[PDB]
C-alpha cells in the first residue's frame, strides 16, 4: 500500500514512523540513524523525552552523508502541557528546533489538551499531590500554534490525546485558521478506538497510534498487566503468515488508514519493524482483531483526572 498518507495541508506524511519515548540519550542517536539507513523517514519526538539533541545529532549526519534531503524526512515533536500559554508556545517550539537541529518541524502537536502551570517542573504538582493546572483554554493555545504556522517554523500543527468534543471545540473555534492535520492516540487491539478514529477521519483529521505494541517498557507497567506482544491469539494470525507478532500490531493499524510509530532501540528490531509492506492481513483478521478490545490504556495520565481538560471522562 501507499508509504505516505496525505495530510489537509496538502503534504504527504509517512505512514510508519520511529518512536522515541524512553529511548535512552546514549542510545537514541543510533537508533535513529539505523531507522533512516533502513528506510524510516519519519521520526516522533518530544521535548517531555528529554533526548531531542540527541535524535538531533542523529538527523544531521544523515543529512550531512548524503543519505537523505532534508525534504525527505517528516519530523514531528509536541508541545509540552507547561508552555499552553499564548505567550510561551513559540520559544517553547524554538528550544526544539535549536536541539533538533533543523529551521523547520513537518508536524508540531498540542501533547495533551490539558495545560500545567509553567515552572522548571514537566509535572508540578502541589502540596497535596495533584497536578497544578494553567487557566490556560485549548482554544487559545491552538491560536498560538497557527502562529507558528504563519512564522514558517512548522509547516502542519495537530494535536494528541483530545477526545471527540475538544477536536470539535478546535473545528467550531471562531476565526480558525488551521483546521488540526493529525490526532495522535494510543492505540491497538486492546484499544481500537472505532469511534473517535471514525470521528477524526470523517473530518479529514489523519489519526497516528501510539503504543501500538502495547508499550511493554512503560514504567509503570506492573508485573502482570496485559501483553500484546504474548497474545496466543495474535502469536496464531502471526505465524499462519509467517510475520512476528509485533510485524501483525504494526500491519494491523495502516490497514485501517492510520499511521503507526512503534519505538525501538535495537537495531534488528528496527528492521524487522519496517518489513511490513509485503504482506497483507484479511479482514477476517482485521475484524477478529478488532474484537479483541477491553478498553485497555497504557498512557492514562492519573494525575491529571481531576483537570478541566482531562480528555478521558468522555466516552471517546
Ligand atoms: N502522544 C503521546 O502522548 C504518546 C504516548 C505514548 C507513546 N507515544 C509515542 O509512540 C511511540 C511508541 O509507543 P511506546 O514507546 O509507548 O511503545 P511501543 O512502540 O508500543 O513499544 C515499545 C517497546 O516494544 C519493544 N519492541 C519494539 N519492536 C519490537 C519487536 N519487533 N519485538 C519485540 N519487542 C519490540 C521495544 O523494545 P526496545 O526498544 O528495547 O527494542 C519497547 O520496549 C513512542 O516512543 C512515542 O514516540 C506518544
Ligand atoms: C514511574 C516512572 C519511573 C521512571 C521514570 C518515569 C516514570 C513516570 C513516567 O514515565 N512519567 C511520564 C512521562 C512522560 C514523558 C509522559 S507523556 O505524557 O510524554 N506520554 C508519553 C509520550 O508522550 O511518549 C507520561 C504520560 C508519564
Redesign the pocket.
Known amino acids: 500500500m501507499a508509504s505516505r498518507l496525505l495530510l489537509n495541508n496538502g503534504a504527504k506524511m509517512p505512514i510508519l514512523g520511529l518512536?522515541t519515548?524512553?529511548s535512552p540519550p546514549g542510545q537514541v542517536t543510533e537508533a535513529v540513524k539505523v531507522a533512516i539507513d533502513v528506510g524510516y523517514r519519519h521520526i516522533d519526538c518530544?521535548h517531555?523525552?528529554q533526548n531531542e539533541n540527541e535524535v538531533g545529532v542523529a538527523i544531521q549526519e544523515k543529512l550531512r552523508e548524503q543519505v537523505v534531503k532534508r525534504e525527505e524526512l517528516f519530523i514531528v515533536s509536541?508541545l509540552?502541557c507547561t508552555y499552553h500559554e499564548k505567550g510561551l508556545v513559540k520559544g517553547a517550539c524554538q528550544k526544539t528546533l535549536s536541539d533538533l537541529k533543523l529551521d523547520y518541524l513537518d508536524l508540531y502537536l498540542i501533547?495533551?489538551p490539558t495545560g500545567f502551570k509553567p515552572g522548571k517542573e514537566?509535572?508540578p504538582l502541589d502540596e497535596s499531590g495533584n497536578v497544578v493546572p494553567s487557566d490556560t483554554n485549548i482554544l487559545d493555545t491552538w491560536a498560538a500554534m497557527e502562529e507558528l504556522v504563519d512564522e514558517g517554523l512548522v509547516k502542519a500543527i495537530g494535536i494528541?490525546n483530545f477526545n471527540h468534543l475538544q477536536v470539535e471545540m478546535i473545528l467550531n473555534k471562531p476565526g480558525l485558521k488551521y483546521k488540526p492535520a493529525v490526532n495522535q492516540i494510543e492505540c491497538h487491539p486492546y484499544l481500537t478506538q472505532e469511534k473517535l478514529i471514525q470521528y477524526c477521519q470523517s473530518k479529514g483529521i489523519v489519526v497516528t497510534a501510539?503504543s501500538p505494541l502495547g508499550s511493554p517498557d512503560?514504567?509503570?507497567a506492573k508485573p502482570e498487566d496485559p501483553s500484546l506482544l504474548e497474545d496466543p491469539r495474535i502469536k496464531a494470525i502471526a505465524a499462519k503468515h509467517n510475520k512476528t507478532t509485533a510485524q501483525v500490531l504494526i500491519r494491523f493499524p495502516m490497514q485501517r488508514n492510520l499511521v503507526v510509530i512503534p519505538k525501538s532501540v535495537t537495531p534488528e528490531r528496527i528492521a524487522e519493524n519496517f518489513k511490513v509492506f509485503d504482506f497483507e492481513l484479511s479482514s477476517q483478521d482485521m475484524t477478529t482483531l478488532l474484537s479483541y478490545n477491553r478498553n485497555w490504556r497504557v498512557?492514562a495520565?492519573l494525575s491529571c483526572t481531576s483537570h478541566k481538560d482531562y480528555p478521558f471522562h468522555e466516552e471517546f
Open positions: 518512536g519515548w524512553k518530544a517531555v523525552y509536541k509540552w501533547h495533551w514537566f509535572f494528541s501510539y512503560r514504567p509503570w498512557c495520565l
